[PDB]
Each structure stands twice: as structure tokens, then as C-alpha cells.
Design a protein around this ligand. Structure first.
Ligand SMILES: *[C@@H]1O[C@H](CO)[C@@H](O)[C@H](O)[C@H]1NC(C)=O
Ligand SMILES: *[C@@H]1O[C@H](CO)[C@@H](O)[C@H](O)[C@H]1NC(C)=O
Ligand SMILES: *[C@@H]1O[C@H](CO)[C@@H](O)[C@H](O)[C@H]1NC(C)=O
Ligand SMILES: *[C@@H]1O[C@H](CO)[C@@H](O)[C@H](O)[C@H]1NC(C)=O
Ligand SMILES: *[C@@H]1O[C@H](CO)[C@@H](O)[C@H](O)[C@H]1NC(C)=O
Ligand SMILES: *[C@@H]1O[C@H](CO)[C@@H](O)[C@H](O)[C@H]1NC(C)=O
Ligand SMILES: *[C@@H]1O[C@H](CO)[C@@H](O)[C@H](O)[C@H]1NC(C)=O
Lengths: 164, 321, 321, 164, 321, 164
């Protein structure tokens, strides 16, 4: 990826999380489980939905079709007519194929950016109070029960705590 | 020891997309946006049936080639279908002047009502019922284009004609007529006594004078003579004036333009499928919500945008492994 | 305890831009690049005034329809304005051959000087001053196109004409002439004694022979006759040769093409506003530094690029909240 | 944002800084104040000025206009002429609308990249000597007077110092 | 103390590329993709030599202007080169009907074989060897277009001609003929006794009747008369029928279309360079693997895509300092 | 750069490394030397090679050429023919010039992304066991001989080690 996260410092995807694109896996004294981050999953949904719509709508007034007849002594204008309809056909075909290639690339790197932004939302919260495992995981320097985990997930984590 | 991990979705999707830097990239979710499927049929366009000329051309239809009687009084159409090379065209060989311009006009028309403009009974001093040919057979016997009349001499005389018609209708009027080019002076005098003939036609805009061309030509449909046809649009309240001392193929029926609208002439060998569509092509109809298709450039109705790609797939989800 | 923070700008801007992934996005700074404003006037183009035909057509102007006298000797123009359907066109009904090709030629011309090429006094053996009509009134009395002459018989004779003109000028010369189509043999002999007439015209390039067409036509501007006009460009050092024994509408004035340059013919109902511009459209002028406008496709001068958008705004600053 | 900074780990913008796009807010024993980073504000100004100019200049030779007349028996070529002028009009309209959408997006993410690059210019200077507050701020492990702050701002900060 | 560093490549490259946000950016590696170089020659296209008309036009070549004898029986060509304004065109002044449509046809043809279709000896009752002119000199003495014959009267009589030709070949046949327009009745009767003449021509498709136009014209190449030429494609198994009582410029040689294929007519002043190429332009040939060139829009062969840029360079490596 | 690495926190390029685009410079008890990272150099080579090929191939069906003749009373269709060939010429010229500008920019920022991703591949390996010099360098809290350096380079570095 372009942002280093997806298939980068986070080596693989979670077949286990089905509630969203980006999320968490916690492991504490009350057990394990997956949890999707709705705030960033929904935002990414709005984004690529707008992307799809902007593509469809920008190309509604394209080039049309109409057939035209020419007699045997009108070969020049018949050829002109063919060449210009094939012309617009080619540039619109190029315009659609190129647009898809370009945006598909922005979209993949968009997801890669969202994950990296999520990892840092947590990292910038658990400052001293945890250590970077280097693989997308954070080891806690204390006990983080299910209420505490939620404080990390919804961005209300409290730093006023010791850690050693 | 307690810990929390940040990660992303993954599934069993095998769907790929392309990027500028990488082809065949498997992702979690994708969206196809290219329609590649058609029903292979010619359908009604929003409930209104197309006009399917069968083995008839536009010329055969409008002039009234006897083989095209099916289209004598055609109902409203959505579009027109014509074969690449219709068998029933000009039964009596010749040419139709400004044919492509007339076909173009047809693409803006949805309905004619054919009216009789000059009755066959009104030809007091000529034969209006002897103008038939083996080139134009109907049920085993000689005939002719139904909407015009091939007038000939009566009692070895062809009085010069002065006939005129005022378009008192609210509609534009499509008027057709022609001139006969014989193969020799003998044929000339035998059909129309007068050896040196002309046809003059006038309207507000038209100032025409035709004279027959005698020449030796190869037989087409068994004839070395030629019929050359002409058309004009008669404006409401305008009149058309014919004068002629021979070789005149006179109007009998004309066409009131009673519905203008977007239409087209499709070249297609397909026949009427008994379906309805919102989007038609010469090789079949399209039922789709895609923003693109790759079926055919020539299209009518509420359609996706045509494109030459055989694959267009957008990425929605992230890279899958 | 001491600390430092990193942050970004913010202000009170309500200006929005669009992105592929988000519409109506408020940012700090933006730049409009789409001109949407015009003065609604027809102006000079860089100080040089356009030629505003009023109720006159290009045909009326060039042929010299008596109602178009305002344009008898027109100064240099930047562009030409013609109404959609000028009232003063061909006062005597008929047609102008290759009119659209001539109008196209006009779009590359900035200035004519009209010169007299064949004086009216030089018609020794014909009437050069009786060719007038109620279809072409001027100040209550019958008249005719000023730049050509409708010649008729003198003492019940029409000697065949052999008149020719050498273009000794440095400029190309636009030469106009015509033929009269009467409505019958009686009118024919009465205007021009000879019953069977022609007009032949030749140059280096032109090899023309016209014969009048007699026919019964509907009255337009009170006439059933027609005048049919022709034109050619006479090259410098070339000559034009006319021969005719009747129906000849002879040249009197021709047009030296004395300035070629980029120009156009605008269809517009607007009249001259008394302004100056660098960029003109049929619905008003543009004063702008924008790279785009959405005012009208048809444009002349140093102009922005036309586009169908009703909004184009670029982001310069960052997201605002 | 794509880079996580703007409206990300830096929750909001400074209505107080009017000297530039990106800058600093310091708080020490000599008082408070805002200070714009000229080096990165000017660079961003050159960038989007070039962007605007490159857009204007790439589309100077577009499609022109000229009106043409056709008689009543020239409807085919009239229609051809209309269809081709509408054709170029559509592709140039698409080309301008699409270009704006695409670059506007690069421009927003450009600013987001500049801020993030500024936060790291400081972070990579104040190594041990300060702690990440997680909100775009840095708490010092010593006293940073107004001369010392300037050393951070102009990239001449001296690490040879204790910190505990 | 032990340490490891991460860094990137750098070199002595001065090559720059442009970006949307930065011009003249020096990078380590780049790839030019715009060909800007041509050999300035006209070459064979894949080994097959072009037809280089020299000072001859297509009309001069096909009609057989005596000055164009070099091209009497031309071998297969890849493309055709014609000067902007060939000196040897229509030696006897006049015009070639539908010339541009014929030249267009030529662009789909790679080889003719010229065959004699009507032998000069077969003109029993006319003079087939007196039709020459000082407008068409050959080696100091008067001559004429070689592929058609200017027939005149014999023993002060011009019997009406009834000559016909059946295309028994497998190939389409390009047939050329003409009509002579004299300057007066005296010249008419002196060349062809009959004062009132015509030429009729018919095929399956063609129904033509020409009559000469007498007029006084300016001298071109010393002549005030004009020759007007016509052409048609005779389908295999079809016949062409000529009838004429004067002014007939009859076919002698016609052209079997014996190879169709992609071709073009290049306007260029260059002569044959003795080279071979895969891609040709009117100003020189291209040998390249680039995907783009900026040499000339008009191109034939396996070519790069033309573009108006004078620089296209892609970045491969990273920024250099 | 957009990613902060190239001509950013890594102030300059290595005239010394000629084996690849991205690499390492080590300094230990066995001496000094440069070493290119093949994994990331090759990947970047595949990427811009695909980029070049995708550009060449998307524009193979462009607009063609053919000359057409018109007589003196066909100026309108002659002008139509000229205007439409110049038309397609302009949009294809714009399409190539714009495409180059855009991708050249993605390509520079692509390299900047690869370097930054390389610096973090190392940083996320040498967690506690080294300190960020802030200039693209890592000072070791132990002895890293030539076999140990290789463990960093090929991604098999062993964290089970003390560090103080
Ligand atoms: C991508 O996959 C398709 C079929 O799914 C295959 O035909 C093609 O070879 C692949 N493309 C590349 C670049 O390998
Ligand atoms: C046709 O008849 C109408 C109504 O009677 C009349 O007003 C009109 O002038 C006539 N049309 C022509 C052109 O003769
Ligand atoms: C953005 O603002 C416009 C104008 O006020 C409003 O009509 C519309 O809801 C918004 N546009 C879109 C596409 O959401
Ligand atoms: C026109 O006149 C000039 C001299 O006055 C002469 O040289 C030229 O050839 C003439 N042109 C024609 C075609 O008569
Ligand atoms: C870039 O370099 C070229 C080549 O020397 C120079 O002529 C030009 O001025 C430069 N362009 C810009 C806009 O800096
Ligand atoms: C010329 O023709 C006339 C009559 O047509 C005839 O009497 C005479 O013998 C002919 N002379 C020649 C030279 O054949
Ligand atoms: C030409 O000749 C062939 C055989 O001689 C014949 O079958 C064919 O009908 C002829 N063509 C015409 C139109 O006379």
C-alpha cells in the first residue's frame, strides 16, 4: 500500500470482522472479540459512494449515436461522418477506462490511509500507557477491561493513569 | 497481559480490479458499471411499436410498391427498422432524388396519415388506369406503385396537364411525383403522343422543369426504361402546381406529417420480438441500470453510455489476501 | 509546563468546492474560474464596429434591395450581425444560388469597396431604366435591386448582348447577376421579344448557360415570376463574358474584396450597443480574465473557453470548520 | 483528511493564526502567541499557484465556435455539424469538471500532508526532550524560552541537553 | 557505536520532468516517449514504392496528358504523392466532374492495369486521328490526352454513334469520357457538322445526357474551348452505352481495378528518396519505437500517435539533488 | 516530497548507492558500506514499468489522419473537416500532456512513499533496541555485526535481546 498499513505493517486482513472495513481486536481479562469502528467505516462509505456517483454523473452528457445515410458519390462526407463518430467514441472510451484505473488506485490507497489513521488515533491516545508491538497491535502497561477498551474505541480514553 | 489490535476487513471475494500501477488486484468489494447483456430482440420503445419494414425499403413503402401493401396505412411508430438491402425497393428501376435527405427527415417523424390528393377519377383526358408493368407485379399480374399514377395518352392525344393542389391541412404534406425516361422515340410517341415533353413543378420554394432523357440502358427487373422520383414538403396554405405534356408520374396519395418527435432508422436483419424496452439497439434491447454498455453504438431511448471496453469494474472495498 | 502546538489556518469563509468523494465542501480559500456574466450588448470588436444588417439579409444587402439603402457603401467591419429572419430579403421572389457558400466566404472578409462595373448608360440598344417592380418599392413607387439591372426590349427588339469585363484591379471581385423566369410566353415576348432565350456566362473557370423556365407559380410579394441570382469571384486579370438574348439581369455594381481577415456572421436580434469589447457573443459581450465562460458557444475575439457548466470553482486553501 | 492531520489528530483549526496556512502556538514562561511557518506556507503557495496556472494553460487551445449555415436539403451535414460541435463541447466540459474535482481533492490532501510534515519536523527535533500530547501539541521536559522556541521553528534546535 | 541508515539513490542526471505542481524537476531516471525526428525523405512503404506523380496531377495521369507519359502503365504503389499545384494537369482547359470523389476512390486503390477498351481503328465513319491541339503539345507538335479520343467529322458528315462496351473482366473498371464545349456555331459545324448535338451515356446505374454549351470564354492555355470529363465505375458484367452525334470525347483506355487496399494521396513537394520505411509523412519518414510523434498529422503505415507537444517525458526514477 | 522522506527528513540522496533506488548505509565494528533493498527496488520497478505500459496501451486507438480534397464551392464542409480533425488533435494532445503531468507527480510521490515505508520497516523492527537519529539514521543500543545488519535488511531481525 501507499500508506504502509494494509498488507504492510499490518500483515493481513481479518476474516473475522464482518461489521465494517476498519476495526479492532481486543484481548483482555474478560475475553476476546472483534469490533468495527463505525465512525471511520461510515466515512469511507460516504466517500466511495460519492466517488461512484461523481463518475456516473460527470459522463451523462457524452457522445450520442444517430445513423446517417450517404449515396455513392458522397464517400468523402460519409467517411468524415464515420471518422468523427469513431473519434468521439475513442476519446470517451479512453476517458472511462483511464478514469477507472486512476480512481481505483486512489480508492485502494484511500483505505490504506484510513487504517493508518485509525492506528494513529489509538497510538496518540495510549501514549505512555502502552507499547507498540510493531504489527498493528498495542500491548497495555495496565489492565484494560471492556469499559476501558470502549474508551479507546470511541475516543474518550483517559490518560490520567500511572504506567509502571 | 492486556492488549488491543487495529486491523481491516477481509473475505472470500475473488473479484479483481485494475489500477495504473497494478493489474488483476483482488479486492473485498467491487462494482461493475459496464452492461454487457442484451435480449437480442427488437422491442416496443416505451409501449409504442416500431415500424418494421420487412423486405421493403423506405422508397418501396412511400411510393407504394405493390409488394409492400402491408404498409399502406401505417400506425404511429417509435423507430423504423430497415434491412441492409431490402428486396422490394424500386420495382420499376430508376432513382429517388435526395433519398438520403428524405430518410433523414423520416428520423424526425413518428406518424403519417396518408390522404388522397388527386383522385384517379379526375383524369378526364388521359388514361389513368393503364400505367402498369411486369416489373411491378401484384398477385401474378402487372401493376405499379400505388401512391402515384403512370398517366398515358387517350385516343392518341395527350393534352397538356395543368393540375394544382392547395394544402388546406394544418400539417406539412409530403408530396411525391416522378418522370418516366423511355428508351426511344417510338416508345415516347406510343405512350405519350408528343415527342418533346417536359414536367414543370412549382411551389413557394420550388421552380422545377424536367425533360425526359432517351437512352439505351441495360435491363433491370426486365426494363430498360427508368422512373425518376421527386419529393417536397408542402407547407400548409401553400400550393403545388404541375404542368406536363407527357412522361408525368402524377401524385395520387400524399402524407400528412401528423407527429414529429425523436426517432431513427435502424439497419437490422432482426424481426419484431414481442417485447417492450426503454433502450433499443440494432442487435437487441437493453434492460440495465449501469452507466455504461458496450453493445452497439447506435441507440435509441433512455440508454447507458456506449463505450468500447469489454470490462469496467470500480473498486469499493480494500485489497484482499 | 512549557509546550508547543502545530496547527492550521481557519477563517469565516463559507465558500464551498466539490470533490469526487465529497460535495459542498467548505474551504478557507477558493478561486472561481468560470465567467457567467455578459453585458447583453453588441459592441465594437477592438474598436472596429460590426456591420449590423437591420431588417436586411445578406442577399438584400449585396443585391441592393431598395429597402437596404443604408448599406449601399459599407465601411470596414469586425463581424456581421443578421436577424434570424430578416424582413428585407429578396423583394422580387426567387433564389440565390450557392447562398450558404457565399455567406461562408463573407466570414473571411472585412471590407468591400463597391465599384460600378457596367454603367447603366452603356446599354445602347436596350431599356436599362424600365426594369422595376411593385415587389420592390422605394418611397411609394416601384423599383428594383440597385446593384444589378433588369434589362428589357427597346423598340420591340432585343439584340443579343455581348458584353465583357476585365478585372484590372489587384483585388478579387465579387460579381452578381441573374435570370428572370416569367410565368408565360406572353410575358416572355412582351418583356423580351425573343421567345427562346439563354444567358451564357464564362470566365477562366466558369462555363454557364441558363435558359428561363416558364411555369405557373403562387404569388410571393405579389409576383408569380422569379428572379434567380448567381455569383462568382473574378480573379484579378481575368475576364467575365456575358451573352444573352433576353431575361438577363445584368451586373451594374460589383465588390472589390479589399480586406480579408477573421470574421463571422452572428444570428442575433440585438441591435448595436454603443460599447467596445475584446470578446463578443450573439447575446452580449464578455469582459473577463476567467479561463472559462458558459455564456454562448458562438464567439469572436480573444475569449475564454466555452463550457456547459454553471459552476467551476477550484480549491486553493484547506478544509474549513 | 488523507494524512490524518487536518481535522484528525489535530481536532481543529486556529482562528487565531492569520499569517499563514501552517504554524505554531507556543506557551512558556514569557507568555503565549501564534507564529506561522513561512518556509512551508510559501512552498504551499508556490504549489497551488503552479497548479492553478497549469490548469489555465493546458486548456488554452480548446474547441472553438464558428457558426455555419445550411439550406433545407442539407439536413444531414447540418446535423453532422451540430453533433460534432456538441461533441467537443461535451468532452471539454467533462474535462474541466473532472479536472477540478480531481485536483481539489489533491489540494486538500496536500494541505493535510504539509501539516503532518510540519508536526514531524518538530517531533524529529525534540526527540527525548519532549512528550507527544497526542493532539498536535508537545510538552517540554525543560524550559523553552522565546529564543529556544525560535530554534524549533527555524530548524536549528539543539539536542545536546539533558532531559529529566 | 553501531548504526544503520536508510536512504535512496542519486546520480549525475540532469534530466527534468514536469508535474502539475512543479516544472523542471530534475530526476534520476526518465523516459522520452515523443519522437521528434524524421529522415526528410519519401520512402517505400514496406518495400513497395509510392507512385510519385511529378509535375502531373491525378487528372493528367488518368486522362493521359502527353506530358505525363511516364505514368502510362504504372506498377503497384503503396501511396500516391502529388504536388500542391502540379504543372501538367488539364492541358486542354476544362473541368473533371466529381474529381474529389474520384481522388477519394483512388485512396482505396493500389493497382490499375490499363486496358484498351475501344480501339482507334474501330472508328470507321469518323476521324479518330485529327483530334489534337497546341494546348496539348508533345515533342514540339500538337497532341491530346492519350486515353480518350477527340473524334471529329469525316467527309463533312458525323453519323450518330452507337457504341457499347460489356465489362467481361472480374475487376471493376474505371471508364473516362468527355464532351467538348466549342466557342461558337461556326466551330461547332466545322468540327462536327451537326449544329444541335448531345451525348447520352447509360449503365445499370447511369442515365446521362449531355449537350455542349457554346459561350465566349477567356483563353486558358491558348484555348477558349473547354473539355469536360466524366467517369464511372463499370461493374463486372455490366455494359456502358454511348450515343452521340458530335462533341464526344470517346474512351480508348480504361482502368481495371486490380488491387484494393489502404492507401492515400500525399500533398508534398519532396521527391523519391531511395529509402524504405514502415511509417511515412508528407515531410519525411519515421523510424521509431516511441508511442508518440509530433512530426505531421497526415500519416501512413505502422506509426506512433500524432500529438502537438514539443516535449513528452515520463519520470521513472526519483527526485535528484 | 508528499510523504516527507525524500528531500525531507532524509536531507539528501546517496551518490554512493548504485545497486537500486532505495537502500541502506551501515556503520559497525566490521566497517562501512551501502546495500540496496531488492524487495522494494524491484517492486517499484514493476510499478513504473506497468505505469509506462498502461500509458502507451491506453492511447493506441487514438485519432487518425486521412487527407480529403474539397472543391471551391465546398468550403463549408472543408472547414467542418478541418475543424473536426483539429478538434480531436487538440483533445488528444491535451490528454497526453495532462496525463504525463499527473502521473509524473504520482511517480515522484511514489518513490517518496517507498523510502518512508522502508524507514518504518526498520523502525518497527528495532523497537527499544535503537534510537531515531532524526535524519534517516538509527543508532543501536547494542552491537550489530554484519550478520545482524542482514537480519534488519531481510526482515528477520530478532527482538529477544536486552537494551541498556
Ligand atoms: C488478469 O486476469 C485475466 C483473467 O482473469 C487474464 O486473462 C490475464 O492474463 C491477467 N492479466 C495479467 C496482466 O496477467
Ligand atoms: C390556398 O387556399 C387558402 C385558403 O382558401 C388561401 O388563403 C391560400 O392563399 C392558398 N394558397 C396558395 C399559396 O395559393
Ligand atoms: C450543495 O448545495 C446546493 C446549493 O445550495 C444544494 O442545492 C445541494 O443540496 C448540494 N448539492 C449536492 C449535490 O448535494
Ligand atoms: C485583362 O487585361 C489585361 C491588360 O489590360 C491583359 O493583359 C489580360 O490578359 C486581360 N485578361 C483577360 C482574361 O482578358
Ligand atoms: C525550464 O527549463 C527550460 C529549459 O532550459 C527553460 O527554458 C524554461 O524557462 C524553464 N521553464 C520554467 C517555466 O521554469
Ligand atoms: C464527300 O461527301 C460527299 C457527300 O457526302 C460525297 O459526294 C463525296 O464523294 C465525298 N468526298 C470524299 C472525299 O469522300
Ligand atoms: C455482358 O455480357 C455477358 C456475357 O456476354 C452477359 O451475360 C451480360 O448480361 C452482359 N451485360 C449486359 C448488361 O448486357
Amino acid at each position: 500500500g501507499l500508506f504502509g498499513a494494509i498488507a504492510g505493517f499490518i500483515e493481513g486482513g481479518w476474516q473475522g470482522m464482518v461489521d465494517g472495513w476498519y476495526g479492532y481486536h481486543h484481548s483482555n481479562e474478560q475475553g476476546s472479540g472483534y469490533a468495527a469502528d463505525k465512525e471511520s467505516t461510515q466515512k469511507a462509505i460516504d466517500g466511495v459512494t460519492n466517488k461512484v456517483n461523481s463518475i456516473i454523473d460527470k459522463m451523462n452528457t457524452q457522445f450520442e449515436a444517430v445513423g446517417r445515410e450517404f449515396n455513392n458519390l458522397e464517400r468523402r462526407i460519409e467517411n468524415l461522418n464515420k471518422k468523427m463518430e469513431d473519434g468521439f467514441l475513442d476519446v470517451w472510451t479512453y476517458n472511462a477506462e483511464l478514469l477507472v484505473l486512476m480512481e481505483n488506485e486512489r480508492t485502494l490507497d484511500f483505505h490504506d490511509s484510513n487504517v493508518k489513521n485509525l492506528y494513529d488515533k489509538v497510538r496518540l491516545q495510549l501514549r505512555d500507557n502502552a507499547k507498540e508491538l510493531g504489527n498493528g497491535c498495542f500491548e497495555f502497561y495496565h489492565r484494560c477491561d471492556n469499559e476501558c477498551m470502549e474508551s479507546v474505541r470511541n475516543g474518550t480514553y483517559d490518560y490520567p493513569q500511572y504506567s509502571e | 497481559s492486556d492488549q488491543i489490535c487495529i486491523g481491516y476487513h477481509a473475505n472470500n471475494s475473488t473479484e479483481q480490479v485494475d489500477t495504473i500501477m497494478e493489474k488483476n488486484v483482488t479486492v473485498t468489494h467491487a462494482q461493475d458499471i459496464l452492461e454487457k447483456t442484451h435480449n437480442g430482440k427488437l422491442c416496443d420503445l416505451d409501449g409504442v411499436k416500431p415500424l418494421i419494414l420487412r423486405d421493403c425499403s423506405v422508397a418501396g413503402w412511400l411510393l407504394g410498391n405493390p409488394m409492400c401493401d402491408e404498409f399502406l396505412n401505417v400506425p404511429e411508430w417509435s423507430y423504423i427498422v430497415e434491412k441492409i438491402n431490402p428486396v422490394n425497393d424500386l420495382c420499376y428501376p430508376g432513382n429517388f432524388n435526395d433519398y438520403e435527405e428524405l430518410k433523414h427527415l423520416l428520423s424526425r417523424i413518428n406518424h403519417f396519415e396518408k390522404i388522397q390528393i388527386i383522385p384517379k377519377s379526375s383524369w378526364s383526358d388521359h388514361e389513368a388506369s393503364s400505367g402498369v408493368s411486369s416489373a411491378c407485379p401484384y398477385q401474378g399480374r402487372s401493376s405499379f406503385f400505388r401512391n402515384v399514377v403512370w398517366l398515358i395518352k387517350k385516343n392518341n392525344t395527350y393534352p397538356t396537364i395543368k393540375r394544382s393542389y392547395n394544402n388546406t391541412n394544418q400539417e406539412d404534406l409530403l408530396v411525391l411525383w416522378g418522370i418516366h425516361h423511355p428508351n426511344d422515340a417510338a416508345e415516347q410517341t406510343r405512350l405519350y403522343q408528343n415527342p418533346t415533353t417536359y414536367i414543370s413543378v412549382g411551389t413557394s420554394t420550388l421552380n422545377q422543369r424536367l425533360v425526359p432523357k432517351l437512352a439505351t440502358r441495360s435491363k433491370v427487373n426486365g426494363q430498360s426504361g427508368r422512373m425518376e422520383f421527386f419529393w417536397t414538403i408542402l407547407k400548409p396554405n401553400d400550393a403545388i402546381n404541375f404542368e406536363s405534356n407527357g412522361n408525368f408520374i402524377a401524385p395520387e396519395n400524399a402524407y400528412k406529417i401528423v407527429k414529429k418527435g425523436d426517432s431513427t432508422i435502424m439497419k437490422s436483419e432482426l424481426e419484431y420480438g414481442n417485447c417492450n424496452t426503454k433502450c433499443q439497439t440494432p442487435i437487441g434491447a437493453i434492460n440495465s441500470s449501469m452507466p455504461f454498455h458496450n453493445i452497439h453504438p447506435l441507440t435509441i431511448g433512455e440508454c447507458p453510455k456506449y463505450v468500447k471496453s469489454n470490462r469496467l469494474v470500480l473498486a469499493t472495498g480494500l485489497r484482499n489476501s
